[PDB]
Amino acid sequence: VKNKCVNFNFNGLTGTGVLTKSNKKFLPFQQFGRDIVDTTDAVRDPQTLEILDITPCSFGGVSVITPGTNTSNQVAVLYQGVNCTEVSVAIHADQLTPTWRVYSTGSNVFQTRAGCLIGAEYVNNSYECDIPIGAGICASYQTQSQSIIAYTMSLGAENSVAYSNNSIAIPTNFTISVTTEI
Amino acid sequence: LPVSMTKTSVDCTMYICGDSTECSNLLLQYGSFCTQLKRALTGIAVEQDKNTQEVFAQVKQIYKTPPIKYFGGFNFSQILPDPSKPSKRSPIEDLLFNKVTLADAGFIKQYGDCLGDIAARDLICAQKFNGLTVLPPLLTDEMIAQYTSALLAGTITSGWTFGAGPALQIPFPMQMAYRFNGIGVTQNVLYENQKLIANQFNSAIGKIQDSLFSTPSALGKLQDVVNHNAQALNTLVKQLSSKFGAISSVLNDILSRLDPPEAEVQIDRLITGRLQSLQTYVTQQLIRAAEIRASANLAATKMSECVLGQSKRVDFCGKGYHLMSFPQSAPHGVVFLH
Amino acid sequence: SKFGAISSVLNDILSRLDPPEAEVQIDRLITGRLQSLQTYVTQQLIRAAEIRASANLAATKMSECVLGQSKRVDFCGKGYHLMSFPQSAPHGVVFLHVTYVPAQEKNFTTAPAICHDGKAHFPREGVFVSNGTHWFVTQRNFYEPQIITTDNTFVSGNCDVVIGIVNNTVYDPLQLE
Amino acid sequence: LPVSMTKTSVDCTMYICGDSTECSNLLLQYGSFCTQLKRALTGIAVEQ
Amino acid sequence: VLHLTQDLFLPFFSNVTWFHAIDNPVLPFNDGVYFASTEKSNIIRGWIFGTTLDSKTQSLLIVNNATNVFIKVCEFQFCNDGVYSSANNCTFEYVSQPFLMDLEGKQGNFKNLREFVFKNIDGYFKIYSKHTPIIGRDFPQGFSALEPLVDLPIGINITRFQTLLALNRADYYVGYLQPRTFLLKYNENGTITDAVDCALDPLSETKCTLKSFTVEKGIYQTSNFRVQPTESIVRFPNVTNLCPFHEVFNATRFASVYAWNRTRISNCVADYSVLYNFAPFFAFKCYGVSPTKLNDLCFTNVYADSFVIKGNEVSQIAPGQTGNIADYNYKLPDDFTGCVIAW
Ligand SMILES: *[C@@H]1O[C@H](CO)[C@@H](O[C@@H]2O[C@H](CO)[C@@H](O)[C@H](O)[C@@H]2O)[C@H](O)[C@H]1NC(C)=O
Ligand SMILES: *[C@@H]1O[C@H](CO)[C@@H](O[C@@H]2O[C@H](CO)[C@@H](O)[C@H](O)[C@@H]2O)[C@H](O)[C@H]1NC(C)=O
Ligand SMILES: *[C@@H]1O[C@H](CO)[C@@H](O[C@@H]2O[C@H](CO)[C@@H](O)[C@H](O)[C@@H]2O)[C@H](O)[C@H]1NC(C)=O
Ligand SMILES: *[C@@H]1O[C@H](CO)[C@@H](O[C@@H]2O[C@H](CO)[C@@H](O)[C@H](O)[C@@H]2O)[C@H](O)[C@H]1NC(C)=O
Ligand SMILES: *[C@@H]1O[C@H](CO)[C@@H](O[C@@H]2O[C@H](CO)[C@@H](O)[C@H](O)[C@@H]2O)[C@H](O)[C@H]1NC(C)=O
Ligand SMILES: *[C@@H]1O[C@H](CO)[C@@H](O)[C@H](O)[C@H]1NC(C)=O
Ligand SMILES: *[C@@H]1O[C@H](CO)[C@@H](O)[C@H](O)[C@H]1NC(C)=O
Ligand SMILES: *[C@@H]1O[C@H](CO)[C@@H](O)[C@H](O)[C@H]1NC(C)=O
Ligand SMILES: *[C@@H]1O[C@H](CO)[C@@H](O)[C@H](O)[C@H]1NC(C)=O
Ligand SMILES: *[C@@H]1O[C@H](CO)[C@@H](O)[C@H](O)[C@H]1NC(C)=O
Ligand SMILES: *[C@@H]1O[C@H](CO)[C@@H](O)[C@H](O)[C@H]1NC(C)=O
Ligand SMILES: *[C@@H]1O[C@H](CO)[C@@H](O)[C@H](O)[C@H]1NC(C)=O
Ligand SMILES: *[C@@H]1O[C@H](CO)[C@@H](O)[C@H](O)[C@H]1NC(C)=O
Ligand SMILES: *[C@@H]1O[C@H](CO)[C@@H](O)[C@H](O)[C@H]1NC(C)=O
Ligand SMILES: *[C@@H]1O[C@H](CO)[C@@H](O)[C@H](O)[C@H]1NC(C)=O
């Protein structure tokens, strides 16, 4: 059963992960496989004499972004650093360790460089960052009638200077500002 | 000056007890000795994000250079963003990005090709195996170059006015006149030897590119930061290979071989070893984070003083009587052009 | 936290077991509590170093912006620093940076130098600024147009090498009297 | 103003196992634990 | 306080089966069963528990009456309706104040709602109750803690559940408990004003990991997600290397007991199905190892001593035995780690 998270007990080497075909160069006497950090990487099939690779199962980390509970109860779920199709099939097969299930409408799907975001919808507009998610993506609570929206952070107002060969601007007036700093 | 380093979110639970219910139960007896580590690591990530934000996002308005680039004979193509390049980076920025090699990029989503590694799996797949992941930074290497571009465009088309108030355009010639006046030489010499100073500046700009190209390692500070982080990560991963004084270094082997009440001592020994190793890693990461925070504060104040105006303190903005500085983005750091 | 021992309460565990076999659990409790304390003290040292750096920065900012005026830009608040008034805060300090910031600006004109008669005139301080018809001089950070006199300018040049030079006349109070 | 403090190169084997082969062997069971300390002290000396 | 605990609780917004009355299906009991019933005066009497509900395994009977209770750990025979017909192996008679108390303000609209929860962790039967004339429509929404009444260490086998009704001339609310981690808000008087799950909603999990009831705007790292593997493969080498057990069982001249042939077996995989299928045994007594557990142990060396003998001599041959064979022909060591086969 390849290309599936499966508990393996190969010749006494027991572990968890996904196994598939490989293009290793195992010598005939070779039985196990490893890497620089001494973690079992490849195993030879004792009854097939083929080479299989060992992978983490689905490792990631769930982070929840939310506004104040006194404001709203709606929440959004981040699955850190996982392709968002993999969580989709795992949810549909009901093999995810998290038992809480955030509903998937198809419009709340977001493949982000930081992972897959569920429960928020993409708006192609640009706003100032409110809740940092990562990879230049920020979410906030915004009315449509209210929901959680995800957008690329606006670096600021787009402004262009009036540089020229012989044109200058001199302030004819001035203001007094009292800032604060802690 | 380095600005930040990779953000990690080690999870002690299955870093120490790989999918072992009894090991998790044993770990539960050690109290909240894990929440401390998770909170410390997430705090370190937050401070690093804050460091890069302080050291770069200094101007609220993003500016762009005028389409024509003739600033009184001065040449800025080597530092201005390249429209032909799809990443919109300076030629020097390209050299900085190519002379730095990151073992762990972070924004890779490398799951799905570890099974397809064919050869021996690499460092990142190894980390993914045993409960260690890298959290990608908020400010992508892309728009940060946009920030540096905005800062550079502000400092050559408006002098230093835009750092105190509204951006007021000043042509580059009398801007240099004022930078000469701020050090103690009258603008007349610049207005006589404009051609000579322009040629000298162009020659220096051209030579610094060759200096960065031909040097063995001038970006050694950023490379050292990356190498130290990778080495700490590698030794943390390798520490799971130590029996720590028990029968074997494989928790699952110990579980499947001995009874619970006798393998209990061995798994407790493994917990005491692995958790303490994670403690050393976390403390060392804290020290490195404090050091890089101090360096990033220094970089922020250096940028605010030298780049956004003329600094009167000697040797602070490079050796000699300072005139101006030009910022350039680097992997996990910044590069200055005094 | 039991720390892998019989119980987490010392007075009970000594009152539940005799010494010669209880000392194992006592040692386990000792090492658990000692490791927790070591982690706490290390974190406290880290926090103390960070707060020491912050306090040194605060002291420097205090001695700069309050006991005088600092020319370091974006140090004593955004904009041109004027003063700063400290305020007491719980376990901290509060500054009130008073900063001069410009306002409404207008395009007028500029000239790097003005040539009256074969000689280039440069402003002693400020910009040679033209309304659009008449050339004038003023400061950098405020628009105070003034008549171009020989007191506002110093002459040194030959009126042939200044790129972008402009034509006009300069005034002097000595020829009239 | 202080500038530097006394550079140290503590040695794991000599410090914790005085010339004892079995002690060193059982130390080796702890993995590369103290190599980190040796690297840290070397880095401290270089920094100073 | 905002104490957190882990124990078998009824999940929030879980599924509760609602029944009626006017037969008495026996619902399974596993990891506890939640109960509730609202009534005017009374229609329910007691509960019976246990496995197969007959006079063979110890069971339970909790009938309540007008003044007291009748809890008893008994092994009653059958009633199929005077509710028991056997008290031979029955002990633990317990009587106390009735669980149900009814209060009515001169009108029956105050339907007394009674909430019961039972569990059998390491024996120690526990009963939970809080009685109030709640709104009375049905299973309500407002929070309500549960007051323990009796903690009794039964310590018997328990598998099925049933309840006993009353006579006459809307209830039955049944839920199940699962191991979950919860938060409980304690009032300054000590009451539980509100409680939160940690395995129901992402927001609830955040309130758990950041233990509180108010969460500020922001991002919080709560836990990790891992896909549990679906199937488990066990793979071992293609080696078969069948032992000579066939050759020691298919022989035709099994030696006499006086000259017992001792065969040395090495370098083979000891599959015991080959001995299982070859002989209809009559004595497969094992001493050092379990007869079921022979295929999961690796042995340094195996001796197969075969000799045909009489019938009673089969029982004679055993460790620490005596007899004309056990003393002069073959004597089994007292520390015999092995099995004998007689067919
Ligand atoms: C510079 O800007 C000031 C405000 O920042 C102006 O002061 C204002 O004056 C008006 C009346 O003219 C008041 O109504 C207002 O409250 C404020 O005091 C000031 O006039 C202006 N001066 C110039 C020359 O632009
Ligand atoms: C500014 O400096 C540029 C250096 O990158 C000059 O580009 C050069 O272009 C020539 C061909 O046009 C190349 O052969 C050379 O390698 C370099 O890329 C650019 O001309 C220059 N412009 C001005 C106005 O000085
Ligand atoms: C050039 O600068 C002159 C300042 O002296 C402005 O001239 C003014 O014109 C008025 C009449 O319109 C006079 O009464 C006054 O004394 C002054 O000379 C003039 O507006 C300005 N030109 C432009 C285009 O800004
Ligand atoms: C400023 O005015 C000068 C005369 O006062 C001009 O000088 C003249 O330049 C012309 C050629 O442009 C010569 O033919 C003539 O002999 C005299 O030298 C000067 O050009 C002028 N410059 C500008 C920028 O207006
Ligand atoms: C805890 O219990 C106290 C003792 O009954 C309560 O105080 C009482 O409050 C009532 C009003 O509800 C007063 O009339 C009475 O005199 C006494 O002060 C207290 O409210 C209660 N706290 C709770 C339930 O939160
Ligand atoms: C394993 O044994 C079976 C049974 O004889 C045989 O069909 C198969 O080819 C063998 N495979 C290997 C790799 O030895
Ligand atoms: C991950 O990203 C997408 C979405 O799943 C798809 O191309 C594939 O699964 C992965 N691709 C890469 C390059 O990792
Ligand atoms: C609007 O958003 C969609 C995706 O949500 C994107 O493809 C499109 O380019 C956006 N439009 C603009 C004008 O940015
Ligand atoms: C400035 O002058 C140069 C040369 O005199 C010319 O190439 C350029 O187009 C001019 N730009 C402006 C804005 O006047
Ligand atoms: C100067 O002129 C440019 C030309 O478009 C204009 O954009 C800018 O706003 C002007 N600045 C002023 C009037 O201060
Ligand atoms: C409870 O069960 C019913 C019917 O089986 C189903 O419709 C409902 O969705 C279930 N509720 C939950 C919370 O699972
Ligand atoms: C009710 O049960 C108790 C249990 O001891 C018993 O004593 C009593 O006789 C029963 N009947 C009444 C009417 O109380
Ligand atoms: C009670 O147990 C005894 C054995 O101790 C048994 O003989 C008897 O049949 C049991 N009573 C029943 C099953 O009613
Ligand atoms: C002996 O071997 C034959 C051939 O496999 C088999 O049919 C028979 O049942 C065996 N008899 C015994 C006693 O093992
Ligand atoms: C053991 O020896 C006896 C001697 O008579 C023989 O009959 C029997 O077949 C032997 N069993 C073996 C070789 O397995």
Chains with ≥3 CB–CB distances under 8 Å to D? B
Nearest to C72 by CA among B308, A171, B153, B60: B308
Distance between CA atoms of residues A55 and A18, nearest Å: 5
Would you state the structure tokens that stand for residue B249, as one six-digit string?
A: 């270094």
* Residue E256 DSSP label: P
Residue E134 CB-density burial (10 A; 0-12 exposed, 13-18 middle, 19+ buried): buried
A66/E205 CB distance under 8 A: no
β-bridge pairing E218-223 and E71-74: unpaired
Q: How far from chain centre, in Å, is Cα A141?
A: 20
Those residues whose C-beta lies under 8 Å from the C-beta of residue A92, and which sit 6 or more positions away, are none
- For residue E210, give every residue at least 6 positions away whose Cβ sits within 8 Å of its Cβ, in sequence order, or none: E220
Q: Are E67 and E165 in contact (CB under 8 A)?
A: no
Is A161 near chain C, with CB under 8 Å?
no
Place of tokens 């020829």: C175
Rounded to a whole number of angstroms, the distance from the CA of E329 to the nearest CA of chain B is 40
Does A175 touch chain C if contact means CB atoms closer than 8 Å? yes
Q: Are C79 and A177 in contact (CB under 8 A)?
A: yes
**Partner residues linked to C89 by β-bridges:** C92
- Secondary structure in 3-state letters for chain B: CECCCCEECCCHHHHHCCCCHHHHHHHHCCCCCCHHHHHHHHHHHHHHHHHHHHHHCCCCCECCCCCCCCECCECCCCCCCCCCCCCCCCHHHHHHHHCCCCCCCCCCCCCCCCCCCCCCCCHHHHHHHCCCCEECCCCCHHHHHHHHHHHHHHHHHCCCHHHCCCCCCCCHHHHHHHHHHCCCCCHHHHHHCHHHHHHHHHHHHHHHHHHHHHCCCCCHHHHHHHHHHHHHHHHHHHHHHCCCCCCCCCHHHHHHHCCHHHHHHHHHHHHHHHHHHHHHHHHHHHHHHHHHHHHHHHHHHHHHHHHCCCCCCCCCCCCCCCCCCEEEEECCEEEEEC
Instruction: Enter the tokens of residue C82.
Output: 């004027």
Taking the C-alpha atoms of B107, B109, B115 and B116 in order, what is their torsion angle to the nearest 10 degrees?
A: -70
Q: How many CB atoms lie within 10 A of CB B103?
A: 17
Pairing mode of beta strands C120-123, E4-9? unpaired
- Give me B135's structure tokens: 């959290």
Tell me if residue E242 falls in helix, strand or coil.
strand
Q: Kindly give the residue spans of alpha helices, DSSP state H, lying in E256-307.
A: 273-278
Residue E94 CB less than 6 A away from ligand 12: no
Instruction: Assess contact for E217 and A131: CB atoms under 8 A.
Output: yes
Cα–chain center distance at E29: 9
- β-strands E33-39, E171-176: how paired? antiparallel
Question: What is the SS3 string spanning D7-37?
Answer: CCCCCHHHHHCCCCHHHHHHHHCCCCCCHHH
Task: List CB contacts (< 8 A) between C140 and chain A.
Answer: 170
- The counts of H helices and E strands in chain E are 5, 19
Taking one residue from B and the other from C, the number of pairs with CB-CB distance under 8 angstroms is 107
**Exposed, middle or buried by CB within 10 Å (0-12, 13-18, 19+), for A103?**
exposed
Choice from E10, E13, E14, E15 to test ligand 11 binding pocket (greatest atom count within 8 A of CB)? E15
- Compute the distance between CA of residue E104 and CA of residue B196 in angstroms, rounded to an integer: 105
Backbone torsion region of residue B79, taken as left when φ is above 0, otherwise alpha when ψ lies between -120 and 50, otherwise beta: alpha
Residue type, A51: I
Q: How far apart are the C-alpha atoms of D43 and D2, rounded to whole Å?
A: 19
Q: Do C106 and A170 make contact, defined as CB atoms within 8 angstroms?
A: yes
Contact E249, E278 (CB under 8 A): yes
Tokens matching residue E127: 């009963």
Spatial contact of E229 and A16, defined as CB atoms under 8 Å apart:
yes
- Hey, which residues 46-85 in chain C have their CB within 8 Å of chain A? 77-79
Q: E strands of E44-89, at which residues?
A: 44-50, 59-61, 71-74
Tokens of E282: 């009559």
Cα separation, B92 vs B207, in Å, equals: 12
**Nearest CB to B109 within list A53, A83, A156:** A83
For ligand 6, atom 12, which residue shows the shortest CA distance? A47
Q: Burial of D6 by CB count in 10 Å (0-12 exposed, 13-18 middle, 19+ buried)?
A: exposed
To the nearest whole Å, the CA of B286 is away from the closest chain D CA by: 14
Residue matched to tokens 């007890």: B17
Ligand nearest to the CA of B110: 7
* List of residues 6+ apart from C17 with CB closer than 8 A: C6, C25
- Rounded distance between C-alpha atoms, residue E229 and residue A4, angstroms: 8
Decide: A122 and A48 in contact? Cβ < 8 Å: no
Q: Pairing relation of β-strands E33-39 and E44-50?
A: unpaired
The ligand 11 atom nearest the CA atom of E14: 13
Total length of chain D: 48
E strand or H helix that includes residue E149: strand E147-152
Phi, psi of E189 (to 5 degrees): -85, -5
3-state secondary structure of E179: strand
- Any bridge partners for residue C29, and if so which? none
φ, ψ of residue E182 to 5 degrees: the values are -130, 160
Give the position of tokens 């000792």: C30
Query: 3-state DSSP call for residue C43?
Result: helix
What CA–CA distance (Å, rounded) separates A175 from C104? 10
User: φ, ψ for residue E4 (rounded to 5)?
Assistant: -115, 140
For every residue of chain A, which 3-state class applies, written as one string? CCCCEEEEEECCEEEEEECCECCCCCCCCCCCCCCCCCCCCEEECCCCCCEEECCCCCCCCEEEEECCCCCCCCCEEEEECCCHHHHHHHHHHCCECCCCCCCCCCCCCCEECCEEEECCEEEEEEECCCEEEECCEEEEEEECCEEEEEEEECCCCECCCCCCCCCCEEECCEEEEECCEC
Q: Is A51 touching E (CB cutoff 8 A)?
A: no
Q: For chain E, how big is the Rg over CA atoms in Å?
A: 32
For residue E307, the tally of other CB atoms under 10 A from its CB is 18
Run of H or E including C96: strand C92-102
Residue B135: strand pairing partners: B7
Helix, strand, coil percent values for chain C (each to nearest 5): 35, 25, 40
| Mutate: best of B23, B29, B270, partner C, most C CBs <10 A | B29
Burial class from Cβ neighbours inside 10 Å (0-12, 13-18, 19+) for residue C139 reads middle
Q: Which helix (H) or strand (E) holds C15?
A: helix C10-16
Q: Which residues of D7-19 are buried (b: 16+ CB within 10 A; e: fewer)?
A: eeeeeeeeeeeee
Q: What does DSSP say about strands E231-233 and A5-10: parallel, antiparallel, or unpaired?
A: parallel
Q: Which residue has the tokens 């919860």?
A: E182
d(CA E160, CA E174): 13
Distance CA E317, CA E329 (A): 10
What does chain B come to in residues? 338
| Distance, CA of A55 to CA of A20 (rounded, Å) | 9
In a 3-state reduction of DSSP, which class is residue C54? helix
Max Cα distance, chain A (Å): 88
Residue D25 identity = N
Q: Best mutation site among A18, A69, A84 for testing chain E: the one with the most E CBs within 10 Å?
A: A69
Q: B22 vs chain E: nearest CA distance in angstroms?
A: 16
Structure tokens at B248: 């074997």
Label residue E114 left, alpha or beta by phi (over 0 means left) and psi (-120 to 50 means alpha).
beta
If interface means Cβ-Cβ distance under 8 Å, which residues of chain E face chain A?
A: 199-207, 213-238
Among all residues of chain B, which has the CA nearest to that of A158? Answer: B62
**Residues C73, B305: Cα–Cα separation, whole Å:** 6
Tell me how far the alpha carbon of residue B93 is from its chain's centroid: 14
Q: Which residues pair with E116 in a beta bridge?
A: E35, E129
Q: How was this structure determined?
A: cryo-EM
Phi, psi (deg, nearest 5) at residue A108: -100, 80
Q: In 3D, which of B285, B334, B259 has the Cα closest to residue B41?
A: B285
Do the Cβ atoms of A91 and A101 come closer than 8 Å? yes
Resolution, angstroms, 1 dp: 3.8
Two tokens, residue D6: 């006394």
The alpha carbon of residue E308 and the mean position of all alpha carbons in its chain are separated, in whole angstroms, by 46
Sheet holding A121-127, edge to edge: A121-127, A146-153, A137-143, A131-134
Chain B touched by E293 (CB under 8 Å)? no
Characterise E43 by phi-psi region: left (phi > 0), alpha (psi -120 to 50), beta (else). Answer: alpha
Residue E314 CA to residue E330 CA, distance in Å, equals 12
Distance separating alpha carbons of residues B229 and B235, to the nearest angstrom: 10
**Angle of helix B35-56 versus helix B141-157 axis, rounded to 10:** 30
Contact C98 A182 (CB under 8 A): no
| Region class of C91: left (phi > 0), else alpha (psi between -120 and 50), else beta | left
Which among C25, C30, C31, C3 is positioned nearest to C12, based on CA atoms? C25
